[PDB]
Amino acid sequence: HRILDGIDCTLIDALLGDPHCDVFQNETWDLFVERSKAFSNCYPYDVPDYASLRS
Amino acid sequence: NVTMPNNDNFDKLYIWGIHHPSTNQEQTSLYVQASGRVTVSTRRSQQTIIPNIGS
């Protein structure tokens, strides 16, 4: 498969473009792996129905 | 503007609400402002409501 370590970035954050997920720009995959040690460092935010925007 | 932290080691459950008046005057009467507003949040949460005046 095509595996992509989210590393510290969470898919959503990798999406929006957290100051630190720049690394994951224009990325692609088959199976995005979200990590625990993961965090977001950028203007706090709330995504209503985050679940879906994710899924 | 009130804040009430959670220090204990367990999930706290808050049950609150918002009041909807019958007349644009029942508001005035009770809450002065012509249009209520309520917000309850946390570092990860956030939800805001505005009263629907009516009958």
Half-sphere exposure of residue B28, counting CA atoms within 13 Å on the CB side?
A: 3
Cross-chain Cβ contact A46/B46 below 8 Å: yes
Most B CBs within 10 Å: which of A46, A47, A49, A50, as the mutation test of the B interface?
A: A46
Resolution (A): 3.5
In whole angstroms, give the CA distance from residue A13 to residue A8.
10
A40: closest chain B residue by CA: B44
**Listed residue (B6, B35, B42, B8) closest to B21, CA to CA:** B35
What token pair was written down for B32?
């002065």
Determination approach? X-ray
Residue in chain B lying closest to A45 (CA)? B44
DSSP bridge pairs for A5: A33
